[PDB]
Design a protein around this ligand. Sequence first.
Ligand code: K
Lengths: 95, 221, 60, 159, 50
Amino acid sequence: TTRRRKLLGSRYGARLAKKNRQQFERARVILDCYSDEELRPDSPPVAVKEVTINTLQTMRFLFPQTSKEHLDIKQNIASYKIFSLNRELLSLLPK
Amino acid sequence: VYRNSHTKRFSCRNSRLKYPFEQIWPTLQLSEDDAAMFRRNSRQFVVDLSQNITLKNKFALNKATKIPHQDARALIYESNLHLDAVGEHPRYLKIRRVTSQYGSKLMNVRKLRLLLGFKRRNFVQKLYEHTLLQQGSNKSWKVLCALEAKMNLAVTRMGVAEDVLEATHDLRQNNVTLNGSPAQMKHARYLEPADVLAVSAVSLIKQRICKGLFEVAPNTL
Amino acid sequence: KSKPFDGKLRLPDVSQLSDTITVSGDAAPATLNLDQKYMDKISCWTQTIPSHLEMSYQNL
Amino acid sequence: NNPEDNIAIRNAPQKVFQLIGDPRSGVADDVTHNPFGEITVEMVWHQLKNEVYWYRYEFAGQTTEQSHRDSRLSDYTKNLIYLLRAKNPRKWTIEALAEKFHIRKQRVLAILALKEMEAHKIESGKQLQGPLSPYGLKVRVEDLKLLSLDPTGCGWVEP
Amino acid sequence: HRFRNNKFLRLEPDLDPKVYGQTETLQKQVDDNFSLLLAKHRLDMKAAAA
Ligand SMILES: [K+]
């Protein structure tokens, strides 16, 4: 007497290609899929422009010192983050 | 077999120790009396020194940090009249006989069954036969590799189960997938250097870890 | 009265630091740093992860 | 590249050439001992509340040191590998990244796969939501510069 | 400084994660900072207008 639905699986790449084709193409270039002759796809490689990372540990876990080296790293990340937000805002501010 | 030997408290038996049993489950909660019984295998009293020493201290006295894996047996179970048994007359020193091998050999096979999750002996025998055919020069290391390649033990290494027994139940419930889908022959196969394991019961496993470490989590965020 | 932000991300190459110091600047432990606070719970396996396994706790 | 601050240089292959005899009349290789090591075991931990002992087996324990560092790289280092690969795949090959960070090629590729999966979750909106939203960073590959510790002491310069 | 222990001049204590939750506590901290900025604009407008 289980209410849990049956689980039929599929490879991660298989699901991604149907949900977001752009991400799938980017992953192939990063994961070095164009170096081996046997596994080389026919489609030409796509250039990588933007990536996303998580900086929670680098900001609040990893750099506790008061030296200029640790302060500079945190400030640069904060400054870059604000620039990204401002670019998004400018795209919407105009009437 | 609703025996006491199939419970964690009495799972492992060793006849060469002062207390015959041995504790191998890192998450078992013992009572005060039980802890006292097990502690007798850790502390020993030296007559000439008039002090208590521990097993770790004994290794330091022998200058043992990294030793050949076959030499650790002589340190755990034997005694020396110049380091740890100084002051005892030679007449009362214990020396083993060639007739004690069978008890030791049977005990070690029982350990392999316990680590794998209370497996049957025929299961271990076939595992040994499998390694005889695989490539490699050191027989001892091939056995070790086979144990690691087992799926249920690998799930335990990930850190999502308290012990191997809990990991086995998770496989029967299909809480972990192999290469994107539930595994086939999950109890009999070996994992390869490029296999990918993922949790499908994400909500269940997250609750398990949070509850375990709730008391050791700081009260300041 | 200072130079404005250029708009580029500058990250130091921590790969050039000595092996006696961790990323955070503290002394590098020469052996596994185990604690009784975590070795009696489900974390005992986390602290003793082997070198042939790569585990991610964000994706499990 | 000094042994004091380079564990990798300490853990390097050894060229063994040992002889017994007289080089002017007759010599023979010294085969009276094994200088290549063997499998070792060590006791690592002892829990005093449950009386549990932990033993660690190492294939090459006698010819390596501090092998526990490889699998415990900081999150900052992993993100750096991910960004370098995206910035210039032509120069930052798997071989180059492995040599730079003193790890194996298999580990380099495995790290990239896990970081790529996490990035998709962040972009899709499954992680770093609510109060932790500000910590999801989108980085353009062009706007990235790697500093070096060229000046002796504290201080990172752009070139 | 008379407020030696209350270095940050807080009016209410921080929420306990073990009782209210980690996510709730983090959101409360963000709301507190915005309130301080809003209160600053509040006083200036009232003073300028009246
Ligand atoms: K049996």
